[PDB]
Design a protein around this motif. Sequence first.
Motif, PDB file in Angstrom:
ATOM      1  N   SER A 257       0.727  -0.890  -0.247  1.00 30.27           N
ATOM      2  CA  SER A 257      -0.026  -0.039  -0.069  1.00 30.27           C
ATOM      3  C   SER A 257       0.544   1.111  -0.153  1.00 30.27           C
ATOM      4  O   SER A 257       0.484   3.013  -0.264  1.00 30.27           O
ATOM      5  CB  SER A 257      -0.787   0.163   1.512  1.00 30.27           C
ATOM      6  OG  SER A 257      -0.236   0.271   2.378  1.00 30.27           O
ATOM      7  N   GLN A 261       0.886   4.481  -2.685  1.00 20.74           N
ATOM      8  CA  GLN A 261       1.087   5.709  -3.079  1.00 20.74           C
ATOM      9  C   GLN A 261       2.233   6.659  -3.288  1.00 20.74           C
ATOM     10  O   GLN A 261       2.098   7.553  -4.077  1.00 20.74           O
ATOM     11  CB  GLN A 261       1.431   6.457  -1.598  1.00 20.74           C
ATOM     12  CG  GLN A 261       0.012   6.174  -0.502  1.00 20.74           C
ATOM     13  CD  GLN A 261      -0.552   6.762   0.685  1.00 20.74           C
ATOM     14  OE1 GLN A 261      -1.114   7.281   1.194  1.00 20.74           O
ATOM     15  NE2 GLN A 261       1.274   7.864   1.269  1.00 20.74           N
ATOM     16  N   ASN A 264       2.238   7.657  -6.654  1.00 16.66           N
ATOM     17  CA  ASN A 264       0.951   8.471  -7.189  1.00 16.66           C
ATOM     18  C   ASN A 264      -0.088   7.280  -7.808  1.00 16.66           C
ATOM     19  O   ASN A 264      -1.274   8.060  -8.562  1.00 16.66           O
ATOM     20  CB  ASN A 264       1.496   9.614  -8.266  1.00 16.66           C
ATOM     21  CG  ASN A 264       2.530  10.559  -7.615  1.00 16.66           C
ATOM     22  OD1 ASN A 264       2.995  10.967  -6.373  1.00 16.66           O
ATOM     23  ND2 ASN A 264       3.451  10.308  -7.722  1.00 16.66           N
ATOM     24  N   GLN A 266      -2.553   6.023  -5.257  1.00 16.42           N
ATOM     25  CA  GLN A 266      -3.517   6.717  -4.410  1.00 16.42           C
ATOM     26  C   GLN A 266      -3.504   7.778  -3.301  1.00 16.42           C
ATOM     27  O   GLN A 266      -1.985   8.652  -3.512  1.00 16.42           O
ATOM     28  CB  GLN A 266      -3.187   5.577  -3.042  1.00 16.42           C
ATOM     29  CG  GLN A 266      -3.957   5.016  -2.044  1.00 16.42           C
ATOM     30  CD  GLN A 266      -3.447   4.121  -1.179  1.00 16.42           C
ATOM     31  OE1 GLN A 266      -3.974   2.819  -1.688  1.00 16.42           O
ATOM     32  NE2 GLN A 266      -2.462   3.763  -0.220  1.00 16.42           N
ATOM     33  N   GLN A 268      -1.777  10.620  -1.108  1.00 14.15           N
ATOM     34  CA  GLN A 268      -1.006  10.541  -0.470  1.00 14.15           C
ATOM     35  C   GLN A 268      -1.722  10.912   0.892  1.00 14.15           C
ATOM     36  O   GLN A 268      -0.129  10.892   1.824  1.00 14.15           O
ATOM     37  CB  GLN A 268      -0.220  11.867  -0.151  1.00 14.15           C
ATOM     38  CG  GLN A 268       0.401  11.659  -1.865  1.00 14.15           C
ATOM     39  CD  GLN A 268       1.823  10.711  -2.691  1.00 14.15           C
ATOM     40  OE1 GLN A 268       1.830  10.611  -2.006  1.00 14.15           O
ATOM     41  NE2 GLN A 268       1.464  10.151  -3.072  1.00 14.15           N
ATOM     42  N   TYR A 270      -3.997   9.401   2.413  1.00 17.40           N
ATOM     43  CA  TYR A 270      -5.179   7.720   2.666  1.00 17.40           C
ATOM     44  C   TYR A 270      -4.525   7.142   3.849  1.00 17.40           C
ATOM     45  O   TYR A 270      -5.471   7.020   4.567  1.00 17.40           O
ATOM     46  CB  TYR A 270      -4.899   7.355   1.253  1.00 17.40           C
ATOM     47  CG  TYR A 270      -5.820   6.017   1.203  1.00 17.40           C
ATOM     48  CD1 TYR A 270      -6.962   5.730   1.191  1.00 17.40           C
ATOM     49  CD2 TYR A 270      -5.282   4.552   1.452  1.00 17.40           C
ATOM     50  CE1 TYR A 270      -7.702   4.552   0.345  1.00 17.40           C
ATOM     51  CE2 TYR A 270      -5.693   3.586   1.192  1.00 17.40           C
ATOM     52  CZ  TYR A 270      -7.123   3.235   0.949  1.00 17.40           C
ATOM     53  OH  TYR A 270      -8.091   2.623   1.178  1.00 17.40           O
TER      54      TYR A 270
END
Length: 453
Positions: A257, A261, A264, A266, A268, A270
């Motif tokens: 996960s 991030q 890019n 997800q 930044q 989350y």
Amino acid sequence: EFQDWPIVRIAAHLPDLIVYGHFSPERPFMDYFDGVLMFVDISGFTAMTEKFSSAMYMDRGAEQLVEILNYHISAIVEKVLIFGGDILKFAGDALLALWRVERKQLKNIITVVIKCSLEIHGLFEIRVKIGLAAGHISMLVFGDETHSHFLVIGQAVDDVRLAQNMAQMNDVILSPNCWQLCDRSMIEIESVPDQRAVKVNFLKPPPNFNFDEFFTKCTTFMHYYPSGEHKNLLRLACTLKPDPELEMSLQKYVMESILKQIDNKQLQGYLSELRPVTIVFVNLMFEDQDKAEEIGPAIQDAYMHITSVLKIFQGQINKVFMFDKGCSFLCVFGFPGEKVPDELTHALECAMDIFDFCSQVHKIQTVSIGVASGIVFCGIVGHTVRHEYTVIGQKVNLAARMMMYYPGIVTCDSVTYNGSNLPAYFFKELPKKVMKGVADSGPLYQYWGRTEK
Ligand SMILES: COC(=O)c1ccccc1Cc1cn(C)nc1-c1cc(Cl)nc(N)n1
């Protein structure tokens, strides 16, 4: 100079020990060297996380907490980095740093690291505790084809653990071996009762001594200290250029996960959250005589089973640590995109399975697993250039204390017990013990399993 490549973002989550290593593919992989270790304990990171879950913070508790946490931690990190240290790992409650040098230089580097420790305390006048050790160090790399973990083990590690648990707030404690290796001409100490370690009171340099010049000469011995045209970077790892084989090795150390991030894919923010999770804290104990050459294979074999069960029950390893001759796995169920409605049953069944397998691994003397469920803070903690996904909260601490105080079994808290979709006789209520920093746990249980033996 452009420096925001994926490989550089990945390197932020990793120490130089790993970024600039050249390990064989064999697992376990072990190497040996000398260095100075610093362990920094922050106090309060318990108190305030429970405070920020208050309704006062209007559903921005996680966001507010990570912010003030990173404000304080990133100041510690850059002091470590400017003094030439390598931050090995973060826990919610601490970080461990390393100065790896040749044995002849340990004496001078200890002075560097003691000054560094004094300036860290100077930041807070919220407080910290610091333990220092010096000597031999073994590094252990374990993993499978797609995931890698590392530990340091050995003389100086055990010593830094000793030094850290005596310290009180504002103390800098030296390991007996650090005291024996250090420049006693320059360090003013006091004995600590019933102990061979020492507390550092003052750094008293001779009249000629110039620390800036002294430090500059000590950087001669730091392979990866930034200099020349890179002298104002905090890490040389910032200058890494794209290199697919190196990125392939490094990404195995980082949770998926996080990688999403980094790519890019997800938002930044989350991963900053106060989330309900189940913590499964697995401790593997070895005997005092055991050498790193024998511990490494046991951990590898345990790991190969832990990872396969976690995948089946949808958990993840968040952190691995080792001290007091025990290797511990901070496992988590219900991570950002991994919540299931039978989470609690699965955490117990996974625990029991890990218990049964690892208990038949040769050289592992005792397996102990604590299970606790509730709201924990999740987030990326540290400095921009050096940081790690970490979980913090009373439940994390409770699971850790359960595996310590209730060795050789699987224990769980009352939330996990009442909320599991299992019958009560799979459990046994336990004598409630007083545990350090744990204010009435609730009732605790042994997870006995489906049959009497
Ligand atoms: C309460 O005492 C301690 O936590 C502690 C005290 C002394 C030594 C190690 C630990 C555990 C620890 C905490 N952190 C943040 N990092 C580690 C760690 C990292 C690595 Cl790479 N290898 C090993 N063996 N440990």
